[PDB]
From Swiss-Prot:
This is Metallocarboxypeptidase inhibitor. The chain holds residues 15 to 81 of 81 of the full protein. GO terms for molecular function: peptidase inhibitor activity. The record marks V66 as: Interaction with carboxypeptidase. Keywords: Disulfide bond, Metalloenzyme inhibitor, Metalloprotease inhibitor, Protease inhibitor, Signal. Belongs to the protease inhibitor I46 family. It comes from Hirudo medicinalis (Medicinal leech).
Length: 67
């Protein structure tokens, strides 16, 4: 009934991490795994788009972390 909140799932890879904010579903894990995450500065700073995903729409950004 009101504004639906968006979440974020960080898909993690031993050398790559992509954070996505979804307003209905999550990202499709095919290169590692993903789970609910807060949002570092790289998540919000590199995730500035949107795309139609399985059960909803998710946007995402990826960064070089412990790679």
């Amino acid at each position: 009934g009101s504004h639906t909140p968006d979440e974020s799932f960080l898909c993690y890879q031993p050398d790559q991490v992509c954070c996505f904010i979804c307003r209905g579903a999550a990202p499709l894990p095919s290169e590692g795994e993903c789970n609910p995450h807060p949002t570092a500065p790289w998540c919000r700073e590199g995730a500035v788009e949107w795309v139609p995903y399985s059960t909803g729409q998710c946007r995402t950004t990826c960064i070089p972390y412990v790679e």
